Write a protein that binds this ligand. Structure first.
Ligand SMILES: [Mn+2]
Ligand SMILES: [Mn+2]
Length: 244
């Protein structure tokens, strides 16, 4: 676990970049009732090795929309430089994802995604600047944060009341808002699939509104996990498994 000097630097870096986050729609396809004009959706993930604190595999996929077929994949082995500390996930993962986006620009610039689904939160975060905001600000791409568990910040808890609301979600697309103690909506719990009970936690990363982000996340869900994140997850784990 890092020294305080490193944590301060990281908090200071998060506060500096937070000023560049845009939490409204800035792309024409976002204001369209069926997202007409959206053709390419990105997904990123990093997989790790059970006995290894140094090596990891980072993946970027691009999928066509709305067919959700993989049209681009880049999976590469990387050397970790920071351990996992909750609230500082970007400093473990985002440097490698930025490089993957730069590599896409050099190899297949016409397949640059119009929005990236990130495994982890955006503005639903201890300091309002999670890994999905961090990636968005560093690449300037629109980003959505999709987390598989609830980050307990600003009075949010996975308590008895919270689980009552999860029971109330009955079908894919059903949602309920995640309200901070300041009264502000930090994200949405989303039941992504008809045949899944555990919701997703969706928040704004960059250059997108929450309502658009929730609706797009739902439209990418063949299973519980949205297909761009699901394919990056499957492919980066396969790469590690085959070289292990
Ligand atoms: Mn991940
Ligand atoms: Mn994963």
């Amino acid at each position: 676990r890092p020294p305080e000097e490193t944590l301060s630097l990281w908090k200071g870096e998060q506060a500096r970049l937070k000023a560049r986050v845009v939490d409204r729609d800035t792309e024409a396809w976002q204001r369209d009732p069926s997202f007409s004009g959206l053709q390419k959706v990105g997904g990123v993930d990093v997989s790790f090795v059970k006995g290894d604190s140094v090596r990891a595999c980072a993946s970027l996929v691009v999928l066509s929309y709305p067919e959700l077929k993989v049209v681009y994949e880049d999976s590469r082995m990387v050397g970790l430089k920071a351990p996992y500390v909750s609230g500082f996930l970007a400093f473990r993962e985002v440097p490698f994802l930025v490089e993957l986006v730069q590599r896409l620009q050099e190899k297949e610039p016409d397949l640059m995604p119009q929005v990236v689904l990130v495994d982890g939160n955006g503005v639903l975060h201890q300091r309002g600047f999670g890994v999905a905001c961090h990636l968005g600000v560093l690449t300037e791409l629109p980003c959505i944060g999709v987390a598989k568990k609830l980050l307990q910040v600003d009075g949010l808890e996975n308590n008895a009341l919270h689980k009552e609301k999860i029971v109330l979600l009955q079908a894919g697309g059903d949602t309920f808002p995640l309200i901070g103690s300041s009264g502000t909506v930090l994200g949405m719990a989303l039941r992504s699939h008809d045949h899944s009970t555990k919701p997703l936690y969706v928040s704004v990363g960059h250059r997108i509104s929450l309502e658009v982000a929730v609706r797009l996340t739902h439209h990418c869900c063949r299973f519980r996990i949205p297909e761009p994140i699901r394919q990056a997850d499957i492919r980066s784990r396969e790469y590690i498994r085959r070289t292990l």
